[PDB]
């Protein structure tokens, strides 16, 4: 696990981009092998070796993945400054359009991007499935899929990243069992988020009420002018039993099929 480490001296920090988990997300430049520097994103933190490990364990696993619709890892870095304290860093690639959730809301404004049509909205769904199909076929659970954690690439392509009660599958709220079908649930609500153009899920119902809300058979409503075929797709990701839920490998094609049927 030494191919992924990059010397700190090859990196400079910039402005704070957002606030992520137990750390800060800032901008910076990374000197590459070929001279050129690159705009990147860095996740900075300590709780003994218990927050260091859980932070550098996503990195050690996420690292050797390859997919266009899954965010890639450019390197991890270790600061060790001032008081005799090591602090770690995760070089992530820069996205000049932020995450999909925020970009969805901006579309609603004049200064924001244009009214996003269905094909573009449906396209984003195809991208997330592709990446979620990838991590599925190689036995990785995301455990936190949401348009908040789906950045937008400059080619208007979506990628999955940042490895929330309204997004937990019903069985995972109880049996503490997160599986690849618990992801299928989350991808269904993320499909709702996108169709609404940024609405907080389950309006009216509150976070604690959610378990009883699901155990009685209440799922998300069909949004305004969301197609029938599209809602029955995201509804199918929600069936009470995990094994009756379709998979990422099937969701993608039905989505890819639906997009073609439009002008
Ligand atoms: C954390 C996993 C991905 C990290 N890569 C990454 N790249 C880019 C950004 C980013 O903010 N780009 C902004 C700057 C460009 N836009 C302004 C245009 C006009 F100036 C707005 C968005 C980013 N912000 C994270 C920060 C943590 C948050 O929780 C998710 C998003 N993160």
Annotated catalytic residue: which of 127, 144, 162, 183?
Answer: 144
> Cα(197) to centroid of ligand 1, in Å?
18
- Concatenated DSSP letters for 53-65? HHHHHHHHHHTT-
Q: Would the CB of 20 count as within 6 Å of ligand 1?
A: yes
* Integer Cα distance of 229 and 260 in angstroms: 13
Considering only CA atoms, which of 193, 213, 103 is closest in space to residue 145?
193
* Integer Cα distance of 184 and 246 in angstroms: 8
Q: Which domain holds residue 19?
A: 8-93
* Integer Cα distance of 46 and 55 in angstroms: 10
CB atoms within 10 A of CB 20: 16
3 lies in a domain?
no
Backbone angles phi, psi at 44, to 5 degrees: -115, 140
* Ligand 1 atom with least separation from CA of 94: 7
Judge contact between 124 and 100, C-beta under 8 A.
Answer: yes
* Integer Cα distance of 200 and 209 in angstroms: 15
For helices 228-236 and 180-196, give the axis angle rounded to 10 degrees.
150
80 lies in a domain?
yes
Does one domain contain both 19 and 125? Answer: no
Establish whether 127 is a catalytic residue: no
* Helix (H/G/I), strand (E/B), else coil: 251: helix
Does one domain contain both 205 and 256? Answer: yes
Q: Please state the three-class secondary structure of 145-190 as a single string.
A: CCHHHEEEECCCEEEECCCCHHHCCHHHHHHCCCCHHHHHHHHHHH
Does one domain contain both 139 and 249? Answer: yes
Find the CATH number of the domain harbouring 25. Answer: 3.30.200.20
Q: Please count the structural domains in the chain.
A: 2
Does one domain contain both 88 and 106? Answer: no
Task: Give the resolution to one decimal, in Å.
Answer: 3.1
Alpha helices in the chain (DSSP H): 48-62, 100-106, 118-137, 170-175, 180-196, 210-215, 228-236, 248-260
Pairing of strands 86-93, 37-44: antiparallel
Does one domain contain both 169 and 255? Answer: yes
Does one domain contain both 122 and 228? Answer: yes
Q: Would the CB of 138 count as within 6 Å of ligand 1?
A: no
Alpha helices in 48-117 (DSSP H): 48-62, 100-106
Technique employed here was X-ray
Angle value at C-alpha 255, between 250 and 258, nearest 5 degrees: 130
Considering only CA atoms, which of 89, 78, 95 is closest in space to residue 38?
95
Find the CATH number of the domain harbouring 246. Answer: 1.10.510.10
* DSSP structure class, residue 82: S
67 lies in a domain?
yes
* Integer Cα distance of 115 and 208 in angstroms: 34
Q: Would the CB of 205 count as within 6 Å of ligand 1?
A: no
């Amino acid at each position: 696990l030494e191919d992924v480490v990059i010397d700190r001296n090859l990196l400079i920090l910039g402005r704070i981009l957002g606030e992520g988990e137990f750390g800060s997300v800032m901008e910076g430049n990374l000197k590459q092998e070929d001279g050129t520097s690159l705009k990147v994103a860095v996740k900075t933190m300590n709780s003994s070796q218990r927050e260091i490990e859980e932070f550098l364990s996503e990195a050690a696993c996420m690292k050797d993945f390859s997919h266009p619709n899954v965010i890639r890892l450019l390197g991890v870095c270790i600061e060790m400054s001032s008081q005799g304290i090591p602090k770690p860093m995760v070089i992530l690639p820069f996205m000049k359009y932020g995450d999909l959730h925020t970009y969805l809301l901006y579309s609603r404004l004049e200064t924001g991007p244009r009214h996003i049509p269905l094909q573009t909205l449906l396209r984003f769904m195809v991208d997330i499935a592709l990446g979620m199909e990838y991590l599925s076929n190689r036995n990785f659970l995301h455990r936190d899929l949401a348009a908040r954690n789906c950045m937008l690439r400059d080619d208007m392509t979506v990628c999955v990243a940042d490895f929330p009660v309204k997004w937990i599958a019903i069985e995972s709220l109880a049996d503490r069992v997160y599986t690849s079908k618990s992801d299928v649930w989350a991808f269904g609500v993320t499909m709702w988020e996108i169709a609404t153009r940024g609405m907080t899920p389950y309006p009216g119902v509150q976070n604690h009420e959610m378990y009883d809300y699901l155990l009685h058979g209440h799922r998300l409503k069909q949004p305004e002018d969301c197609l029938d075929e599209l809602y029955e797709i995201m509804y199918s990701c929600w069936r009470t039993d995990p094994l009756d839920r379709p998979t990422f490998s099937v969701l993608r094609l039905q989505l890819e099929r639906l997009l073609e049927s439009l002008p």
